[PDB]
Design an enzyme around this catalytic site. Structure first.
Site, mmCIF file in Angstrom:
data_model
loop_
_atom_site.group_PDB
_atom_site.id
_atom_site.type_symbol
_atom_site.label_atom_id
_atom_site.label_comp_id
_atom_site.label_asym_id
_atom_site.label_seq_id
_atom_site.Cartn_x
_atom_site.Cartn_y
_atom_site.Cartn_z
ATOM 1 N N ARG A 46 98.334 38.074 92.104
ATOM 2 C CA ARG A 46 97.307 38.868 91.431
ATOM 3 C C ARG A 46 97.732 40.336 91.295
ATOM 4 O O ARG A 46 97.473 40.960 90.275
ATOM 5 C CB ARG A 46 95.930 38.759 92.111
ATOM 6 C CG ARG A 46 94.865 39.682 91.473
ATOM 7 C CD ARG A 46 93.415 39.226 91.733
ATOM 8 N NE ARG A 46 93.245 38.522 93.001
ATOM 9 C CZ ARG A 46 93.271 39.108 94.194
ATOM 10 N NH1 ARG A 46 93.461 40.421 94.285
ATOM 11 N NH2 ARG A 46 93.112 38.380 95.294
ATOM 12 N N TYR A 98 84.033 46.378 67.103
ATOM 13 C CA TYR A 98 84.033 44.929 67.345
ATOM 14 C C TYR A 98 82.809 44.464 68.129
ATOM 15 O O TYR A 98 82.314 45.181 69.004
ATOM 16 C CB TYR A 98 85.321 44.531 68.086
ATOM 17 C CG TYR A 98 85.418 43.069 68.487
ATOM 18 C CD1 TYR A 98 85.255 42.053 67.541
ATOM 19 C CD2 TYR A 98 85.716 42.702 69.803
ATOM 20 C CE1 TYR A 98 85.352 40.714 67.895
ATOM 21 C CE2 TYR A 98 85.817 41.357 70.170
ATOM 22 C CZ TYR A 98 85.633 40.367 69.205
ATOM 23 O OH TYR A 98 85.720 39.032 69.541
ATOM 24 N N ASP A 170 91.421 51.320 69.660
ATOM 25 C CA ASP A 170 91.624 49.892 69.619
ATOM 26 C C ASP A 170 92.565 49.680 68.446
ATOM 27 O O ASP A 170 92.157 49.790 67.296
ATOM 28 C CB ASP A 170 90.292 49.156 69.430
ATOM 29 C CG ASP A 170 90.429 47.641 69.577
ATOM 30 O OD1 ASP A 170 91.523 47.115 69.273
ATOM 31 O OD2 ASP A 170 89.444 46.977 69.984
ATOM 32 N N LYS A 195 96.184 38.572 69.038
ATOM 33 C CA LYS A 195 96.468 38.661 67.600
ATOM 34 C C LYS A 195 97.928 38.896 67.366
ATOM 35 O O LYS A 195 98.771 38.228 67.966
ATOM 36 C CB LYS A 195 95.679 39.812 67.024
ATOM 37 C CG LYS A 195 94.270 39.892 67.604
ATOM 38 C CD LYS A 195 93.429 38.636 67.339
ATOM 39 C CE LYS A 195 92.237 38.587 68.324
ATOM 40 N NZ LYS A 195 91.137 39.508 67.958
#
Ligand SMILES: [Cl-]
Ligand SMILES: [Cl-]
Ligand SMILES: [Cl-]
Ligand SMILES: [Cl-]
Ligand SMILES: [Cl-]
Ligand SMILES: [Cl-]
Ligand SMILES: [Cl-]
Lengths: 378, 379, 376, 376
Positions: A46, A98, A170, A195
């Site tokens: 982690r 978004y 962003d 993306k």
């Protein structure tokens, strides 16, 4: 010393003492022996992971930046950044970011976080939103979607830092190939690597890229504690798609320019939206800040109900996300922007016939012909 | 319909009822239950796998062909085709074909298959070698490595098919982006997908692409019985890289030309081999048979020992293999063709100072600059 | 078909058409709408069949109607904690897992009230659940590394009379040894990274529960926080799961062997293991745990802890737990080198306390490694 | 060193830098030579550390100096057979695997003689090595589908009298149960697809042996014909290997329970199992391996096999074996299907002979499914 695009292949590659592997081996181990280790710093998966670090180094390098941090998704990158906004502090943004992003405004709203929406496509409404008391963060997504409007990163960043506030862009839409927010003066670039960057529609991911070392510590502390960390195999996949990122992006761009001209000639098409048109209200800003116009196109369909048009495509897939190798089409009204209301969307100026294209890497003329038959019907 | 630069994306991409996956799922199961299909066709992973089959349709689709079969390696694809040459039958080939093939040729020779090497650039040397009694298979590898000579597939196939012989082209070098052996009149394209097709240097695979239905049956029966099948995860990686095969190759070719110019300009470079040069020994054949002239370059280095040149590269990775995303340099006398016989080398062309570049997709100007300053060393 | 069968066929969610016995791995981030009738697969952060099969499998193990998996155990815990509002009380223990307490800290730094308590006596439990505005009671049992054990049923009955949700971090035990829902809890919390995936090659988290409105809130948060595991990650956890019961019982059986050699050793003092008879909570272990687990701790009397760690050649010195490779660590150096030495002496964590995480190696080889390492 | 520690740690590495407990997955096909001191790695098909790790592990399970892995069992078998020269004979078990006979027919086609033998009688083992230029003696044990057994040590004794090679296809028992090399054979052949990998999600093969010159030829062959497995596939096999012993222990114990169930059913005739007193090599069974396996066959007496096959609701209807999911098949109708009518019955295979491959599911669960199936 070397150049972008060489950065895409070798940037934070590694070297692999021991055997000489050119492609770094995939570190799946959750656990580490702390006795082998001539200088202990890999403890537990982690917190520390070699494969994950390589992806990070690659991403940081694309922007000439000292730090990156990758996440389980784009939403997890945003949630982390937002987490640092304290109660009695204020995140200046826009009514058009978004939907997932706006959800992280929603959740933040309940931890004493004031969300001040105002307009950033103008100078005018920049200064007021910036004079907001207790303002901590300015949140820019540019270009916006599906309207493909933009915000002047450098100017917004100049006026924000005047108040010692943080500016995130962003940058998912454009990718580092086309836009360099940190270069423009922003403090952070945020990506859904789901993306463009990974680019093959087969893995979810997020990233933050930044320079502030104080921010770096707060971000890694959060990721480790919240546990919104990506898998090693999924870091492999994102890392894999990266090599071809600029090759894909400019193929996507070239085809977009093609389809825009196909669209501008259709009797059943109204407005066509594309950041690179000479009519675009912010053409000076696009030319000043973007190296190319992008893989996304929007337009008003006039030939009937959007729902019928959607089915006629026999090459574009209908569905959500963007930037993948396969070209996609959607009607925000029916899909991505479903949760907002019409007058909402109407305030937004998002008609129910607005169609959005995300351009993949198929043959341009193949995509043009699928678009034309679809528009024409029959 | 679809052009090549679309089939890369959508070849082998039939949907999936119920769920709608854009990217098909990876079928890892070795095992199948009868009652879940309506007639029995999936029995066992060795014979049948949707993910493998998806890659195959895609590959076949790139050459407008009925069948493709993929393998554990390029060598495995080669071994399979070669297995169909019976004891007493003659394979006509070249002394400069890939060794892995010739090593395979040696294996065949011990089962009663006879092997004949041949220059396939001259009307006589073609017409003679194609008079080898009991001819059954003409093995064409073009361009040949490391020298990048070129063989006219149409012509050589317009004489093998008179002798009753099947023709294969190892089309690994050019990829189906640049050369189309089946269109040129060949019967089979052989690929190591390990190179440019997978293209990210992270998986092995072979492929055979062809049309003969009788051949299809024989090919599947061998793969089934020999068991040289690729795994699902590997087929997934090959399939994933192939999406960008066209974009990659054209970038690779674009940079190769830049490097060739840099090479030509250098006073410590002798011969330069590249299929695109106005004086390549087969320019017309290259002209007529490929769409671009490939992304491998070879040259004689005059500036000192080849080893010393190799160390001086800071971006080019020194390694064998070719066509992956990372640019690679090798010296055939030290890397690939190494174990040869110092008198023999001069017959086949492979010199001491011969250096071979496999061009990737880094910045063309970065690669050019690395090359120019390996060439400048003299310590 | 019962519980060992649950691991193999649990959610083995079919293959219409091709007949695949092992479900194919769904990696697509997206879905053609048209390709399904009543489209309910849209986007991978929200929908993914591979993830659903794992969740359905995990829920099956507790006969629960729901499960949700996460990128990590921390993410599972963080999700559940997110439902507690500022001013409300989360009652728990001082010796909960350090990741959890960081999450308490984050939440404490948001105004949520975290109250730590002794949860092992009648007095102590009333002196926990009496706090006003009690929305969540957080039980980790057994607690690590001293292996104390909280009575889940009793704490659950008391917490519910004030309307408080009860979660059990059941990572230590696994659902083969302990079933928090059957015992009365509302939520089982897991780091599947540990014994569930079992092979120390994938990070994952999970929640297992029975309330549909809790279900909706958990999924809404996971969608928005985006703390979702990968498709391939889920495949590895699922594949691990198949052998969970076999591995667990091997680990427990070997744990029992190691306990005796420890208690026989002259360079070992106290030994901790829930299954010993003199364990102060011995009735509770019996009642709520089908076997006493595969974690062992002990006071090492024979030299500095760091030298003891340096003498193992089979056990590995590192962290995590529950995997196939046996692990050793020394809390004062490794789970808690970053503690006030003060807060160490009273957590009952000595500077020479040693924790074993038992794998699936031959018990003879592990006993030999331990013995020579102890160097008694 | 004992037989479960080697499953976990055989071939398992430090990482002279990072310390990975589970070794990282080497997917690279090419190796920047320039570093590697005295060069080991040149190209994937020839070299790959992940693949080598799996090989060290497998070799360790039979303490053989050598192991080589392949894309599949067939590929392992194909490799071993290529070393037999035209005009030589292979003696083999006549109910060997068809895939082997498929390869046998290849060598039947490629010059070699394929000659089977009753490998169960002295009065015919001797008249099997009577074959001129005996290259390979090919034993598979237990066999399919009648589970007859061949005395590996005894057959090896006389095979070596002729200077031949002895291979045992040992897929059935796995190295947990049977150790061909210890028994006197020269090579162990495996289809790692089956119980070794264990989860029905990867194909693979292996050869395990001890002679350096066989080693050179086997490796030279693999490199040339290119029947190499991928790095990720080797990862899956290696990962499944950790639990091979626990799984086999489980499948055997359940097989025995199923055998008792079968013997009591009025619609069951002969039952075939290596661990019954009635099995004609039950004595040899006791000699040459530790627990009688996970395969059970029986004559169904209720008419057509499809009647029975269709009634199972837990057992999976299909092929392979050794996996975590229990499988049922009908040899006369599937694995052994295409043999016509004037045959098959010499292999003792009737048309209602049924073969079970026992997974790890709850035994009374598997036991109950078989019951309704038998008693429609
Ligand atoms: Cl610019
Ligand atoms: Cl030979
Ligand atoms: Cl032909
Ligand atoms: Cl609840
Ligand atoms: Cl630690
Ligand atoms: Cl031998
Ligand atoms: Cl034995």
């Amino acid at each position: 010393g070397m150049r972008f695009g060489t950065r895409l292949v070798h940037g934070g590659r590694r070297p692999s003492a021991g055997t000489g592997d050119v492609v770094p081996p995939i570190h799946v181990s959750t656990t580490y022996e702390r006795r082998a280790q001539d200088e202990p710093r890999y403890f537990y998966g982690r917190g520390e992971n070699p494969t994950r670090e390589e992806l990070e180094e690659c991403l940081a390098g694309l922007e000439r930046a000292p730090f990156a941090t990758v996440f389980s998704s784009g939403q997890a990158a945003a949630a982390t950044l937002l987490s640092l906004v304290r109660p009695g502090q204020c995140v200046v943004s826009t009514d058009d970011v978004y939907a997932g992003t706006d959800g992280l405004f929603d959740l933040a709203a309940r931890q004493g976080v004031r969300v001040r929406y105002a307009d950033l496509t103008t100078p005018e409404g920049i200064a007021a939103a910036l004079a907001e008391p207790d303002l901590a963060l300015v949140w820019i997504e540019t270009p916006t979607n599906p309207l493909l409007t933009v915000v002047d990163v450098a100017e917004v960043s100049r006026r924000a830092h005047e108040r010692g506030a943080r500016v995130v862009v962003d940058n998912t839409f454009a990718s580092p190939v086309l836009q360099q927010p940190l270069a423009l003066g922003a403090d952070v670039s945020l990506y859904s690597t789901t993306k463009s960057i990974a680019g093959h529609a087969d893995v979810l991911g997020g990233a933050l890229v930044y320079r502030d070392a104080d921010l770096h510590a707060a971000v890694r502390a959060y990721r480790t504690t919240a546990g919104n960390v990506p898998g090693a195999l999924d870091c492999f996949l994102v890392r894999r798609g990266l090599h071809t990122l600029s090759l894909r992006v400019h193929r996507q761009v070239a085809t977009a320019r093609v389809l825009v001209e196909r669209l501008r000639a259709s009797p059943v098409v109204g407005a066509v939206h594309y950041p690179g048109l000479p009519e675009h209200p912010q053409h000076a800003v696009v030319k000043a800040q973007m190296s190319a116009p992008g893989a996304i196109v929007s337009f008003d369909y006039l030939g009937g109900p959007a729902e019928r048009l959607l089915d006629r495509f026999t090459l574009f897939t209908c569905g959500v996300s963007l930037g993948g190798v396969h070209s996609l089409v959607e009607c925000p009204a029916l899909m991505t922007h479903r949760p907002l209301s019409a007058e909402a969307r109407a305030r937004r100026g998002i008609g129910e016939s607005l169609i959005r294209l995300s351009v993949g890497i198929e043959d341009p003329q193949d995509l043009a012909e699928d678009l034309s038959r679809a528009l024409a019907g029959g």
